[PDB]
Design a protein around this ligand. Structure first.
Ligand SMILES: [Mg+2]
Lengths: 96, 40, 319, 124, 128, 513, 434
RNA sequence: AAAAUUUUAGGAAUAGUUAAUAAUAAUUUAUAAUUUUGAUUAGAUUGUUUUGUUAAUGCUAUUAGAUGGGUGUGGAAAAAUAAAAAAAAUAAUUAAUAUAUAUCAAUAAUAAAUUAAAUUAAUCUAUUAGUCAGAAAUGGAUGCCAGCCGUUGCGGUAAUUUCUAUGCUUUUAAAUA
């Protein structure tokens, strides 16, 4: 949306090269981060919660981040919109 | 501004104003008194 | 318009109905009730002979007064008579109250009495106002009284032109029960300032000051000034310089003050845990009680000066 | 109280008696919690009664409420009617002018029939 | 409180119209069609007609025609008194008439009473 | 011009959307330009604004611009109740002049809000504060033998019928007024505590005379009036020698309790031991988690009397004193008139074969016939949505449930039936718990605004309360075919209304003679 | 929202699941359709659904008047129920008055925020891509009109700025992306009292490292840096609000440099014992909680093994428990509320007075209150209906401010409690000992 | 009614047209009128010794206004909206606030202005910092790597470097005079 044509502060038409067609119709990821979790169960036992992750391959700290997201959801902090935006945010290649 | 007192002639009219400018002779007399006091 | 009905004719009950007959120029209908029908017929004849502008009715029971009048105002003698007329009777004004009626009580009663009267009137749907009177009967005749109305706010705003017909100073204390407490606090301050003025003039005579007419002029311009100090000091000068002289009788007496002070200790919470959470209040009350039983009860309120040391007698021996 | 925007009769509880009403200036009317037009009307009525003019004026509330319901832009006591989009009967669906049934309206009424029967009884 | 500057000057002292806001926007073409269809809705005209620009009511020649063309409410008079009522309205109830009736003309209407329905027609001429 | 500071950039020209004048003109009922065809029986809600509703706009609200013949709608006006003081003549002063006539409407509202900061008691106002001393002198007229109270209630019925529809043959009015209350007391004998509703005149205890010829005034000093009410009020003859009643057009809607043989309270309840069916997918949290519904009181169980208040001789203006629920049963002639008018307009304006699509708003060229069919189908959806179908005796009609508050004006036409119930509070229903069971089990918080009901052959009159003031006006004229064909609303935007309601209807040759 | 026509009211006459409007019937006829549970969406123009949106919200308040505290929570539940039925289609660009490229005319609230030439030429396309991120064309065949109005207001915050007046001096603007609740005129006044408090009590109290909890749009974080606090850190559970607040800190000049934003539920992590982040102790911790009409009423306890409170009292007891582990000694906590918990819920006891008198973990050092000066909505969740405060509730509301310190740090603030004009509790006067 | 004085980095044509006239309301006459001493059109565009600066007859800024089809009314169209310009009986003329408070209501600070130095009295508080010579900052920006090597997602690694505020209205960096 920011790379679409817009009139600037002086009124002249500017257009960024992101909304051109090569960067406009650009796929999201390039690394094989598309993974399968076959089973994800949250079971309330007596005095504890058990989060079962059944999947063939997992990424680095994927389970420990999904547990934090599920704990934040258990306190009632997100909605469907924030979860979808976090899932479509993708991979972030920076530690800070 | 022309004063419309409550004891003027009322116009029983639903298509206009509810009080006319028709005075009482006491109002005429006191208006003449105030007219003379302005005339000085 | 609103129909008004005044209940009770005593020394203070008559001029309220007289002013309601005078100032209401046939706009608000007047009804008169009394403890006896002969007194009500007498005050109706007295209102008729001197010039009556509004029609007035005479009733022997409270039921016609309830079913006819919107506003009921009561001016009785004692607390128990108003308690009998308002709650304890079978044809009671509050127990048979109409929804929207306004019942004002001008008697000095206890706090629990006004509380239960307001509770019964709020359950019946009516509005009860407690507005105890402060002033003289001739000041009530001239139209100067002090009223402390407790009750509803908009009901108090509805009763302001009726209250202004026989009183100049009409104040709103707040909710019900706050109007009957203001007279208690006022007469407690009257007793405390009278005791303080008596002790101060006793110490003035002890110090040897011969000019008291100039002492009251400076004491009125100081921070220890009071209206009771202006009131009692010319009598207290003669009662100090002539201690054998008997004090003269007044309209306000020691028993008249103690009758309203007898409502306060019943309306206050229990003092028995600390045995004295009110030092100068009981210090004035013991002096008034020592002035009452010695034969000076019906006389003036300046008789405390001979019983200042008698107020110490219930403090040294009871402890 | 003659004006709609000067509710003078709403502040009867803001004064204790006659002298308190007649001795208060506009600053004391401001600190009592009175709006500007209302306290101006109160002070003007008091100063007019002091000059010998009692408040004898016509209440202009209902007349202005009548004149408010039209679309005068300046509230100048004129009458400006609203024109709707369809002001003729032919465009509101009515095809033509309604014809009256001339045989129905030319029948004799019931009192006329009763009087004809009474005449036929009394003549014979 | 005058409408001197709110409406055109030919509407000066104008009262009793249906809606005077109609005749300020007649010259617009969607309202010009509505006026000519209304004159056909009122009848009495063989050609398309619009009322003049400086007139709010109908003209005097046009309302005279529609009053003369209007069929009377009483059709088929049986009694000669009922024929005299139709002669009363053509003479003493015409459009913008000037001549008044005569007390001798009321005597003619009071001499033709045959049925009790005729007294209702005759006494209403006595009230006029 | 205006002083504007120069900027080296471009200028923003906003065309921002305001509050529409047509929207507030339609809500306040003062539009006078909306041409609305397809006359319906659904009720119309009008929020009364300050100085926006008068007799001129309410006449067009009764008779709309489409050429109606009869005011066949219930008209709810939120906050339209007016209060009038009595007028009197000043003998003193500079001359003789009449003052005192004023309206307390639109400025002093009912039920002032009580907000304060400090099973649970909150502060509210359920009764109208202005007319409550007027309600008190009516409720004390019935306060107490029992036969004297029964003949007092039978002697004060409105017109002998009191709104109730009962078959009475070979019987005068004074015996009919006793037979109706005898039927009510025979019907309410089986329940320990029940109630019924009647229309009553004002008693003599509420009317006092004043010496100046003779002027009667109300006991509370205030008169409940409607300033936008058109026509003339209903005149009833006093029987005791027939003269007019002084306040006969102001009537009362009495609820009477039977015996046989301002602090609301809120409580939050808990429970011990497919959520959104309109939504396609499954959501992590529901969009509407809670519902709010109006709580009504319990009706005792039910041959059975009609218990419907019908005024066949007058137009009704209901001014409620408490929160009520009115279930209006539509008469058959009104819906038959609306049906024949709508189908006449459909066969006149839309003579095309319409193409027969799947539904009304289908894809295709929107002709005049398709627009008319879509508007008629939307009107039918509005009628089916806002109403329910009940059964009577072999009879069925529309029932419109209307929530009436203190301070409103509910115009009911003649011939319309209605049941009246008292609103007791407000509940909150969880939407996830109501997906499995009834909403009675899904209650989360319940506010009870009415703590009323106490618990201390024939039946005995226990008490009498007034729930509404009924202003009865003379029956508004029903236009004929020729009168409605020539009725144009643009002739009635300024004048001609009092002649429209004084004379019968309008003139057939009005303004084109 | 994608409709399911089988669960609707009339699936035979209206097989699409909703009732199209066509802009001919009155608003109360639409209001009777929505009260019966039927969905409505515009057929041709946005003006039909916009006139149906304003009129229904005015008609519902006329039927349920706000007469007490229990009438406002019922009206908010009813308005949330009815405004969800007022739909608009997903492809809003096929409607008639969306934009006209020749007359430069459009209907909607975009005319209040954007130019007519800028919208009808270039900004109608940028708004079409702005909706696609949050509400895609696949998952949604229809949108709530309140979601459409919030997307237009948040597109203005994305395009241009949003000034925080009178909190920020006319040139510092924030950009809340979507779903981040911005502050109204009523919501600014608890932060205006706090900004006057921080302007005077910085230096007598030596406030250096501030911590802001539940920042939201970040308006509480930027007001602390302006008053002279050098080190501020914000914690917000919304990740998109954290990215936007730190981007606006770079946009707002060089005097907002030591500002940091992390994602945390209420407090920071404080889980690593070997990394020792316990050395970062703050001397002032700010909390500006949200007060929604559904949040203040349903406060009750839940949980068997971990008994916890819900709502506003459960949010306060989370703040009152964990703040001692992140505070330094001789440090204070500042709470900014709006006195609506005492108005909308008067039967329950005071939740802040329940911590001081009962739990005895904090000491009331200072408390301020100020009446509410402006009008508007209060703690508005973004994708819901707008509800402005009525007059009788607005004159009773007050902007509160509570300053508490630790029970263990009485001896440091003992010389603050013995000054004239202060109210020391019974526990502080036992520890002073003259 | 008249005189009079505008600008364009790449400089050329203009016209309901000029004068005469027994001509209101021009059926005629003429070798007509503007323009290279810069026209018409197009672009920019209220003007104004009122602003700012300087040694400066230099450079640089401006917000008084007007408005051939809305109504021939009115003396004059200036008429769809303005805290006064008090508007035909002294409404008020002591004063200061002169407005909020014309107090509710769909509605959003997008936007419009503005930039201190008391406007009644009922006692009683006012007055940035334990100073930071440069040392500090879970304060920004910021990754890289093959593990004998398959979607197992271990580790180096609590990564290291680069820009910083502040003092210090004795003031320092950027543009202009
Ligand atoms: Mg020639």
């Amino acid at each position: 949306a920011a790379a679409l044509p817009t009139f600037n502060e002086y009124g002249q038409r500017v257009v960024q090269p992101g909304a051109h067609g090569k960067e406009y119709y650009r796929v999201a990821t390039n690394l094989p981060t598309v993974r399968t979790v076959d089973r994800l169960d949250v079971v309330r036992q007596d005095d504890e919660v058990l989060i079962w992750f059944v999947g063939r391959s997992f990424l680095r700290h994927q389970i420990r981040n999904m547990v934090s997201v599920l704990k934040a959801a258990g306190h009632g902090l997100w909605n469907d919109l924030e979860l979808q935006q976090a899932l479509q945010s993708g991979f972030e290649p920076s530690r800070h | 501004r022309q004063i419309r007192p409550y004891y003027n002639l009322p116009s029983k009219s639903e298509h206009g104003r509810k009080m006319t400018g028709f005075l009482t002779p006491y109002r005429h007399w006191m208006w003449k008194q105030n007219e003379l006091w302005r005339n000085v | 318009s609103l129909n008004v009905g005044v209940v009770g004719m005593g020394n203070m009950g008559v001029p309220i109905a007289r002013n309601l007959g005078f100032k209401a120029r046939s706009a608000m209908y007047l009804q008169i009730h009394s403890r006896a029908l002969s007194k009500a017929k007498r005050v109706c004849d007295d209102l008729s002979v001197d010039g009556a502008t509004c029609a007035m009715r005479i009733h022997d029971r409270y039921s016609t007064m309830t079913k006819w009048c919107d506003v009921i105002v009561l001016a009785l003698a004692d607390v128990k008579a108003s308690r009998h007329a308002l709650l304890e009777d079978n044809e009671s004004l509050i127990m048979n109250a109409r929804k929207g009626q306004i019942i004002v009580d001008h008697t000095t009663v206890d706090a629990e009495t006004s509380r239960e009267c307001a509770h019964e009137a709020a359950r019946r749907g009516a509005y009860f106002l407690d507005a105890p009177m402060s002033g003289s009967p001739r000041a009530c005749f001239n139209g100067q009284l002090l009223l402390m109305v407790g009750g509803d706010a908009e009901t108090f705003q509805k009763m302001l032109p009726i209250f202004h017909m026989y009183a100049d100073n009409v104040f709103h204390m707040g909710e019900s029960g706050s109007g009957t407490a203001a007279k208690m606090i006022s007469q407690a301050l009257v007793a405390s300032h009278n005791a303080a003025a008596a002790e101060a003039l006793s110490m003035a005579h002890a110090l040897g000051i011969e000019d008291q007419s100039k002492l009251v002029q400076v004491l009125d311009a100081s921070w220890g000034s009071s209206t009771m100090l202006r009131r009692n000091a010319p009598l207290l000068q003669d009662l100090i310089r002539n201690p054998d002289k008997t004090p003269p009788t007044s309209a306000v007496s020691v028993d008249r003050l103690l009758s309203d002070l007898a409502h306060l200790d019943a309306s206050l919470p229990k003092r028995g845990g600390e045995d004295e959470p009110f030092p100068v209040f009981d210090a004035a009350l013991r002096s008034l009680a020592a002035a009452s039983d010695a034969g000076m009860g019906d006389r003036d309120l300046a008789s405390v000066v001979h019983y200042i040391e008698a107020g110490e007698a219930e403090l040294r021996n009871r402890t | 109280d003659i004006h709609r925007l000067r509710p003078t009769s709403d502040f009867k509880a803001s004064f204790k008696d006659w002298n308190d009403l007649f001795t208060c200036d506009k600053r004391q009317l401001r600190v009592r919690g009175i709006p500007r037009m209302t306290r101006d009307a109160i002070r003007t009525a008091v100063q007019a009664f002091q000059n010998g003019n009692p408040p004898e004026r016509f209440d202009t509330k209902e007349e202005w409420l009548y004149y408010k319901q039209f679309k005068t832009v300046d509230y100048s006591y004129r009458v400006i009617p609203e024109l709707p989009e369809k002001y003729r009967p032919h465009q509101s669906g009515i095809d033509q002018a309604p014809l009256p049934d001339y045989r129905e309206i030319n029948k004799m009424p019931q009192w006329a029939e009763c009087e004809e029967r009474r005449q036929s009884k009394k003549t014979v | 409180a005058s409408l001197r500057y709110r409406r055109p000057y030919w509407m000066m002292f104008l009262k009793g119209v249906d809606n005077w806001k109609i005749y300020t926007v007649i010259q617009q073409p969607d309202h010009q069609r509505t006026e000519m269809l209304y004159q056909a809705w009122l009848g009495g005209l063989d050609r398309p007609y619009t009322r003049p620009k400086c007139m709010a009511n109908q003209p005097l020649w046009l309302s005279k025609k529609r009053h003369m063309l209007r069929k009377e409410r009483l059709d088929g008079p049986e009694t000669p008194l009922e024929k005299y009522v139709l002669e009363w309205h053509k003479k003493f109830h015409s459009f913008q008439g000037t001549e008044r009736p005569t007390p001798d003309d009321l005597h003619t209407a009071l001499d033709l009473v045959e049925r009790p329905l005729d007294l209702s027609y005759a006494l209403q001429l006595l009230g006029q | 011009r205006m002083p504007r500071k120069p900027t080296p950039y471009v200028r923003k020209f906003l065309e921002g959307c305001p509050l529409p004048e047509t929207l507030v003109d339609d809500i306040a009922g003062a539009n006078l330009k909306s041409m609305a065809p397809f006359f319906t029986t659904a009720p119309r809600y009008i929020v009364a604004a300050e100085s926006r509703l008068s007799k001129l706009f309410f006449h067009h609200a009764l008779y709309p611009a489409g050429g109606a013949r009869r005011p066949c709608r219930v008209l709810i006006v939120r906050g339209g109740r007016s209060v009038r003081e009595p007028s009197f003549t000043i003998n003193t002063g500079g001359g003789r002049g009449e003052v005192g006539g004023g309206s307390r409407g639109y400025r002093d509202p009912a039920r002032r809000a009580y907000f304060y900061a400090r099973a649970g008691l909150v502060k509210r106002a359920s009764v109208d504060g202005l007319l409550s001393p007027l309600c008190g002198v009516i409720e004390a007229h019935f306060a107490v033998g029992g036969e004297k109270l029964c003949v007092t209630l039978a002697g004060l019925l409105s017109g002998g019928h009191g709104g109730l529809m009962m078959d009475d043959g070979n019987c005068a009015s004074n015996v009919r007024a006793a037979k109706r209350v005898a039927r009510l007391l025979h019907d309410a004998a089986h329940h320990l505590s029940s109630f019924f509703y009647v229309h009553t005149q004002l008693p003599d205890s509420a009317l006092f005379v004043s010496r100046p010829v003779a002027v009667f005034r109300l006991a509370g000093g205030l008169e409940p009036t409607v300033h936008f009410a058109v026509g003339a009020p209903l005149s009833v003859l006093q029987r005791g020698s027939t003269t007019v009643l002084p306040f006969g057009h102001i009537q009362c809607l009495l609820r009477v309790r039977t015996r046989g043989g301002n602090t609301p309270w809120c409580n939050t309840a808990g429970n011990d031991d497919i959520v959104e069916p309109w939504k396609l997918g499954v959501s992590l949290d529901p969009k509407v988690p809670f519902f709010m519904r109006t709580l009504t009181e319990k009706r005792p169980s039910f041959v059975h009397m009609n218990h419907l208040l019908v005024r066949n001789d007058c137009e009704t203006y209901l001014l409620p004193q408490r929160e009520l629920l009115l279930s209006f049963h539509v008469p058959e002639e009104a819906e038959a008139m609306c049906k024949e008018q709508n189908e006449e307009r459909m066969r006149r304006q839309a003579a095309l074969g319409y193409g027969s699509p799947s539904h009304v708003f289908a894809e295709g060229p929107r002709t005049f016939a398709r627009v008319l069919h879509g508007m008629k189908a939307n009107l039918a959806a509005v009628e089916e949505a806002s109403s329910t179908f009940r059964q009577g005796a072999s009879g069925s009609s529309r029932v419109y449930e209307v929530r009436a508050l203190p301070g409103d004006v509910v115009f009911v036409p003649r011939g319309w039936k209605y049941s009246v119930e008292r609103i007791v509070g407000t509940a909150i229903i969880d939407a996830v718990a109501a997906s499995t069971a009834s909403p009675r089990e899904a209650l989360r918080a319940v506010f009870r605004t009415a703590p009323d009901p106490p618990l201390p052959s024939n039946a005995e009159i226990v008490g009498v309360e007034v729930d509404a003031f009924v202003l009865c006006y003379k029956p508004y004229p029903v236009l004929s075919n020729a009168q409605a064909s020539t009725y144009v609303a643009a002739n009635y935007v300024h004048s001609g209304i009092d002649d429209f309601y004084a004379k019968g209807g309008n003139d057939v040759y009005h303004k084109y003679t | 929202i994608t409709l399911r026509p089988d669960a609707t009211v009339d699936p035979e006459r209206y097989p699409l699941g909703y009732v199209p409007l066509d802009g001919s019937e009155s608003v109360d006829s639409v209001w009777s359709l929505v009260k019966s549970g039927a969905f409505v969406a515009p057929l041709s123009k946005i003006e039909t659904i916009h006139r149906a949106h304003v009129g229904i919200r005015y008609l519902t308040q006329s039927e349920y008047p706000a007469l007490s505290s229990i009438d406002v929570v019922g009206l908010q539940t009813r308005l949330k129920e009815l405004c969800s039925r007022l739909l608009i289609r997903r492809d809003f660009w096929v409607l008639d008055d969306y934009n006209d490229p020749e007359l430069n005319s459009s209907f909607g609230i975009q005319n209040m925020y954007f130019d007519n030439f800028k919208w009808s030429q270039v900004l109608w396309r940028r708004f079409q891509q702005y909706v696609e991120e949050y509400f895609p064309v696949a998952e949604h065949t229809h949108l709530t009109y309140d979601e459409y109005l919030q997307l237009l207001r948040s597109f203005s915050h994305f395009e241009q700025g949003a000034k925080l007046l009178p909190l920020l001096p006319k040139r510092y603007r924030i950009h809340p992306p979507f779903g981040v609740p911005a502050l109204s005129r009523i919501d600014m006044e608890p932060l205006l009292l706090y900004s006057q408090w921080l302007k005077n009590f910085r230096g007598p109290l030596k406030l250096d490292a501030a911590l802001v909890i539940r920042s939201g749009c970040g308006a509480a974080v930027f007001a602390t840096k302006l008053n002279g606090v050098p080190i501020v850190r914000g914690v917000d559970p919304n990740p998109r609000a954290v990215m936007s607040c730190r981007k606006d800190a770079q946009r707002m000049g060089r005097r907002f440099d030591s500002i940091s934003f992390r994602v945390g539920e209420m407090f920071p992590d404080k889980d690593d014992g070997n990394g020792v982040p316990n050395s970062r102790k703050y001397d002032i911790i700010v909390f500006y909680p949200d007060q929604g009409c559904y949040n203040l009423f349903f406060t009750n306890a839940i949980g068997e093994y971990a008994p916890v409170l819900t709502g506003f009292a459960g949010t306060l007891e989370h703040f009152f428990e964990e703040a001692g582990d992140y505070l330094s000694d001789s440090g204070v906590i500042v709470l900014c509320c709006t006195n609506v918990y005492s108005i909308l819920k008067p039967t329950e006891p005071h939740p802040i007075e329940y911590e001081i008198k009962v739990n005895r973990r904090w000491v009331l050092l200072d408390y301020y209150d100020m009446p509410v000066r402006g009008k508007g909505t209060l703690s508005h969740t973004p994708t819901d209906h707008h509800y402005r405060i009525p007059m009788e509730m607005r004159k009773c509301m007050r902007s509160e401010l509570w300053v508490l310190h630790k029970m263990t740090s009485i001896a440091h603030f003992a010389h603050i409690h013995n000054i004239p004009g202060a109210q020391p509790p019974s526990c502080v006067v036992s520890h002073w000992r003259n």
